[PDB]
């Protein structure tokens, strides 16, 4: 039974863990928990790895560090790297694009500007997912009829990006499939449901993205769509026979404001809004002031226009 040292998290070991479970091979772990940063420093230098790091793997005099060197090994030990230049390069391109997602996570996970850095990540993400949707036209998995180890890499990534976006797949149904397909593979499915599976976090506990014990919420995602809507607000404006310009089609904005105001008051029922709540109270004071002036302005607009018929002309 081969021996793997890493964090007690998905981290840099997840794909490998899956591959192992794919070949039904049993193994043993040196797991550094969230608050066992010592146990690691205790073994950090005294293990005889050629590049001491995490994770570090050791079996038949194969001393490895580097998630890549490790995964490739297991892959090669099963003749899975490719049968010619073309198929070999194809498998490496999969490797690359999967890492461009797993690593892409960690680069904007340390940022203090996370809830707004993900915005630049998720804008790029589409272009990446799309390519896979196409590749999966007339194919079951990228690179053929059989899912391979890079599919266990993308699965770790997927598992993590779903937390960042719940709607990451809605734009790529061919992947939402590929995902259920993976979960279906007998060995994998049996594993996920097994007791030895330690499910979370995604990154080192310290990371902003995918850190800590578990996901809590909607409050951010909704308030983003509220603020977005109010920074595009437009009134049909129409100047009449004389000077002044009139505001046509009141109701739409008039309606939206009352609704969006009611949304924020239903946010007070929620458990999780208390700190995030203060910002919403500022958006509440902004719109309650907008309805204050909305009520009076339609009155003026109407009463002026009526009286203009009466005195403005004759």
């Amino acid at each position: 039974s081969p021996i793997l040292g890493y964090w007690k998290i998905k981290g840099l070991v997840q794909p490998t863990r899956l591959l192992l479970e794919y070949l039904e091979e049993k193994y043993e772990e040196h797991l550094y928990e969230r608050d066992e940063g010592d146990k690691w420093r205790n073994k950090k230098f005294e293990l005889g790895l050629e590049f001491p790091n995490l994770p570090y793997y050791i079996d038949g005099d194969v001393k490895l560090t580097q998630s890549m060197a490790i995964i490739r090994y297991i892959a090669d030990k099963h003749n899975m790297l490719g049968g010619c230049p073309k198929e070999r390069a194809e498998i490496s391109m999969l490797e690359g694009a999967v890492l461009d997602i797993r690593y892409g996570v960690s680069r904007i996970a340390y940022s203090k500007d996370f809830e707004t850095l993900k915005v630049d990540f998720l804008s790029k993400l589409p272009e990446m997912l799309k390519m896979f949707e196409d590749r999966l036209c007339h194919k079951t998995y990228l690179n053929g009829d059989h899912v391979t180890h890079p599919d266990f890499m993308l699965y770790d990534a997927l598992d993590v990006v779903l937390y960042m976006d719940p709607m990451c797949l809605d734009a790529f149904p061919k992947l939402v499939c590929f995902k259920k397909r993976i979960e279906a593979i007998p060995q994998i499915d049996k594993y996920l449901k097994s007791s030895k599976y330690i499910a979370w976090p995604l990154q080192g506990w310290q990371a902003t993205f995918g850190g800590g014990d578990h996901p809590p919420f909607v409050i951010e995602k909704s308030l983003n769509r509220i603020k977005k809507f109010w920074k595009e607000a437009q009134y049909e404006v129409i100047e009449h026979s004389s000077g002044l310009k009139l505001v046509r089609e009141w109701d739409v904005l008039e309606q939206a404001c009352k609704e969006d105001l009611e949304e924020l008051v239903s946010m007070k029922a929620s458990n999780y809004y208390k700190i995030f709540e203060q910002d919403c109270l500022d958006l509440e004071s902004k719109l309650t002031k907008l309805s204050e002036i909305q009520v009076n302005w339609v009155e003026v607009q109407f009463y002026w226009l009526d009286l203009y018929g009466i005195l403005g002309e004759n």
């Binding site: 779903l162 937390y163 719940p166 578990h214 909607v218 609704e259 009611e262 239903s266 007070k268 458990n271």
Partner: protein, 910 residues
């Protein structure tokens, strides 16, 4: 149809064309004279149902030819030539074409005769069926393994079953066909190589092999089992038990969904799973499942959109869709009209007309060429479009009560009835009930008994459900098993909740046994002698299985029943519990058993009425919420009760308000407890929120509402409230809803007169009745309260002095308390049978008083001023006090005549 005056313009339009020869242009306003166009029409006898009488002013221009059925001897001759053609595939049985053709006609002749429109409307047979059977036979041959004569006859038998008997309701007729099929093979194809010809035993499928072959019962069930988990995982998450009926039904829909034009209408009662099997078989055939997203505020335009897309996708995208239309979806008459045009013709003309016709016509040419064929004319292209729909669109109808006048119109509609395969799932059979029950009680809390134990419990519940519908419901078997499934789910949730609490209190007396033995002194050896309680536990555990039976039944079946209707079902349940070797508590009370004294205080604090009926009701609402509760009360005093319970979190809505559609999406997102004020009116969209359906996500739990997928909190609660019992809620809701009646009935008078009578008849025992059940629960709660006080100080003072002694003089006071219970239990077995002796005299008083109230209630119906409340009758019956039973009775009749004669006029006095 015809104007409410009664004039059909469509027919007059043709008449215009026949007589005039041109017509007046409806929008553009001129005469256009039609050249060289002929009018030919077909129609049924107008004595037939559905049929409208035509104007002699139109038929006066027509030659009428009555064409009837042919011979029964020409039919035999005609289908021989049909069999001739299909037996070019199995030439070794070329001599078998004539007896097959003679049999098919005989089976037809008999089905037409035995199952007529006298038994059921849809019992309508014709040579169409013969030709349907003939083709049905070929398709099985053309795609089956080389056929033995034993194969061919069974092949013919299977198609015979699917064509003539799938439509049959009930079992008397269905058995009749089994024997008819046996009677016909015996007369035309005499073999002892036949087997069991019933549909359960001959299962034909192309799911297992490449060739359509009869398959093995065990081979099929296992094939479904591997595919259902897959379909469960891949599609919407709902787990189910695959049973003997379901396999037979899955094959039915399979052949339907395979044929070029595939239309099956499924008649499944409710909760049968008609809709779920359809979703499945559609997915096995690889058909896109389209399900019209309608609601109270859906226009025809919405349904038009939904249809148009699915049609455009079927030809111009080659989608291969399955359209599931439920009876709920057809909102207006036109909706159904749209559905007709989709089946009798294979296009909806109105959707694509004028410029939208030119856009379609253009797009059509693009895809046709792409595929590699050019079509020259306008007619050539449309015929491809339509022919593509005819093979890619599959409409399955799911109607629950064909008794309903809206669902009647589906079956009635000729277009639908002719181009659909009618299939019947109207009831759950006793074997399929037992099969489902078994798998639900597969979990084993239970322990060996007298007599099997799990086999006994299931047999009770089947005998209860069969007695529930037999006694309570009226109207003939349109509705079937629902409560049964929820009844089983309640029992499983209740036994696990009870056995975890029994073994918890048994662990509390085992930990007290270790603590008293450690100490040993004068009084403590009486405490050790508490094997009475330890001995008692085994008898308490024996009865918890049967006690949970009654409790689950109360939560499921009783919610909407009368004071007397509850008690009476309980009798039938208890005597069923009496025959079966299940042990129940003879002195049992639903309130005390499932309500806690802390909750019982909480409810009344809000302002719930003291009534036993209203306690049981409130209990049913709260205690179980694996499903949404439907509350009915005229005076919305209940809507305030729930408001005081959930406080700030209480957000009230009504199906009728504008903001309802959105305000619910806000209620669901942030855990708001919601009550819906007008239950009678109910849009389709909440529907996924009523059935417990969800899509699980990374952290989030999403529910689809009409369009947008919204997040569920889980601290979110849902209640639906109605005010009038006259108001009928859709069959969908009523089945997935826990119906509870907070109603102040005439039955409530019978219950409440006895309480007032006994206070003035035997004041000593009605006074001791309240404290009997009070001090029963109070002292037992004080027994559990003082056990906790004793253990807290025994662990604190063990190294300290004998402080425990200062609680042991309070435990010396407990020697009155522990034995006070024993004092009261002894006098209870003396009090209860005396209480029940006194119920019968008052019942004789009680029976009279409802019939009197009914009469005074009926005056308020005739006239507005002639009102009477139940309180007015109670106040009057109190006045009766301030052969004894005989004189009190005559005191009632006197006092009622004395007080209520005042508020009526001279005619109504008399």
């Amino acid at each position: 149809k015809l104007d409410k005056y009664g004039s059909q313009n469509v027919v007059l339009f043709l008449r215009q064309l026949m007589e005039k020869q041109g017509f007046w242009k409806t929008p553009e306003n001129k005469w256009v004279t039609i050249e060289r166009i002929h009018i030919v029409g077909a129609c049924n006898p107008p004595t037939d149902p559905g049929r409208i009488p035509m104007s002699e002013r139109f038929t006066r221009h027509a030659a009428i030819l009555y064409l009837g059925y042919p011979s029964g001897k020409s039919l035999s001759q005609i289908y021989e030539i049909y069999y001739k053609a299909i037996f070019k595939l199995v030439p070794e049985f070329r001599s078998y074409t004539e007896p097959f053709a003679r049999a098919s006609v005989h089976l037809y002749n008999e089905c037409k005769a035995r199952y007529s429109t006298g038994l059921q409307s849809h019992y309508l047979f014709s040579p169409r069926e013969l030709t349907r059977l003939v083709r049905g036979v070929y398709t099985a041959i053309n795609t089956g393994p080389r056929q033995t004569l034993r194969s061919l006859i069974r092949l013919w038998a299977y198609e015979a079953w699917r064509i003539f008997a799938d439509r049959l309701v009930g079992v008397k007729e269905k058995n009749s066909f089994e024997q008819l099929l046996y009677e016909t093979v015996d007369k035309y194809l005499p073999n002892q190589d036949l087997g069991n010809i019933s549909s359960t035993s001959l299962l034909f499928s192309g799911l297992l092999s490449l060739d359509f072959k009869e398959v093995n019962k065990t081979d099929l069930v296992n094939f479904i089992e591997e595919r259902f988990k897959t379909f469960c995982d891949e599609e919407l998450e709902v787990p189910m038990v695959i049973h003997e009926s379901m396999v037979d039904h899955i094959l039915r829909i399979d052949r339907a969904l395979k044929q070029v034009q595939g239309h099956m209408m499924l008649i499944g009662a409710s909760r049968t799973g008609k809709t779920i099997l359809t979703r499945f078989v559609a997915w096995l055939n690889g058909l896109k499942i389209v399900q019209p997203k309608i609601h109270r505020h859906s226009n025809l335009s919405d349904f038009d959109m939904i249809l148009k897309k699915a049609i455009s996708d079927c030809s111009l995208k080659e989608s291969r869709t399955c359209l599931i239309i439920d009876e709920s979806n057809i909102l207006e008459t036109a909706f159904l009209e749209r559905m007709n045009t989709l089946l009798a013709n294979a296009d909806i003309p109105d959707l694509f007309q004028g410029e939208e016709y030119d856009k379609l016509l253009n797009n059509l040419r693009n895809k046709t060429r792409s595929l590699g064929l050019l079509l020259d004319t306008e007619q050539e292209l449309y015929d491809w479009f339509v022919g593509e729909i005819a093979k890619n669109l599959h409409v399955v109808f799911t109607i629950c009560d064909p008794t309903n006048n809206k669902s009647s119109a589906m079956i009635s509609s000729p277009a639908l009835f002719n181009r659909c395969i009618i299939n019947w799932m109207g009831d759950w059979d006793t074997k399929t009930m037992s099969q489902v029950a078994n798998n639900m009680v597969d979990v084993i809390p239970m322990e060996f008994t007298d007599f099997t134990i799990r086999d006994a419990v299931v047999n009770i519940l089947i005998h209860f459900d069969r007695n529930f519908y037999q006694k309570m419901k009226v109207g003939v078997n349109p509705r079937s098993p629902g409560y049964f499934i929820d009844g089983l789910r309640a029992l499983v949730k209740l036994v696990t909740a009870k056995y975890q609490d029994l073994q918890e209190n048994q662990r509390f007396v085992n930990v007290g046994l270790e603590k008293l033995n450690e100490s040993v002194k004068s009084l403590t050896f009486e405490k050790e002698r508490w094997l009475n309680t330890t001995k008692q536990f085994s008898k308490t555990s024996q009865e918890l299985i049967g006690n949970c039976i009654i409790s689950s039944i109360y939560e499921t079946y009783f919610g909407h029943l009368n004071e007397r209707e509850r008690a009476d079902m309980l009798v039938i349940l208890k005597r069923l519990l009496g025959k079966f070797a299940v042990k129940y508590d003879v002195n049992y009370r639903f309130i005390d058993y499932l309500v806690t004294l802390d909750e019982k205080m909480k409810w009344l604090e809000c302002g719930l009425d003291k009534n036993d009926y209203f306690l049981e009701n409130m209990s049913i609402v709260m205690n179980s919420q694996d499903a949404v509760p439907f509350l009915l009360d005229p005076s919305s005093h209940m809507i305030t009760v729930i408001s005081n319970y959930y406080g700030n979190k209480t957000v009230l809505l009504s199906f009728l308000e504008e903001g309802f559609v959105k305000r619910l999406e806000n209620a669901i997102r942030f855990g708001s407890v919601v009550i819906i004020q007008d239950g009678e009116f109910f849009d389709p969209i909440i529907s996924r929120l009523i059935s417990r359906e969800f899509n699980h996500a990374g952290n989030r739990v999403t529910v689809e509402i009409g369009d947008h997928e919204v997040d569920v909190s889980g601290d979110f609660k849902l209640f639906i409230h109605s005010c009038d019992p006259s108001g009928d809620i859709p069959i969908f809701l009523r089945s997935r809803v826990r119906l509870v009646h907070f109603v102040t009935n005439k039955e409530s008078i019978e219950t409440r007169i006895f309480d007032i009578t006994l206070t003035e008849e035997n004041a000593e025992m009605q006074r001791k009745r309240e404290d009997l059940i009070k001090l029963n629960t109070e002292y037992k709660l004080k027994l559990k309260n003082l056990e906790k006080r004793l253990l807290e100080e025994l662990n604190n003072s063990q190294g300290n002095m004998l402080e425990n002694d200062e609680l042991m003089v309070t435990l010396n006071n407990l020697k009155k308390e522990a034995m006070n219970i024993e004092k009261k239990l002894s006098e209870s077995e003396e009090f209860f049978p005396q209480f029940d002796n006194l119920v019968e005299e008052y019942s004789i008083i009680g029976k009279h008083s409802v019939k009197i109230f009914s009469m005074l209630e009926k005056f308020g119906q005739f006239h507005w001023f002639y009102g009477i409340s139940i309180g007015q009758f109670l106040s009057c019956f109190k006045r009766v006090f301030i052969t004894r039973v005989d004189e009190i009775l005559w005191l009632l009749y006197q006092e009622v005549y004395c007080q209520f004669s005042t508020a009526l006029d001279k005619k109504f006095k008399m």
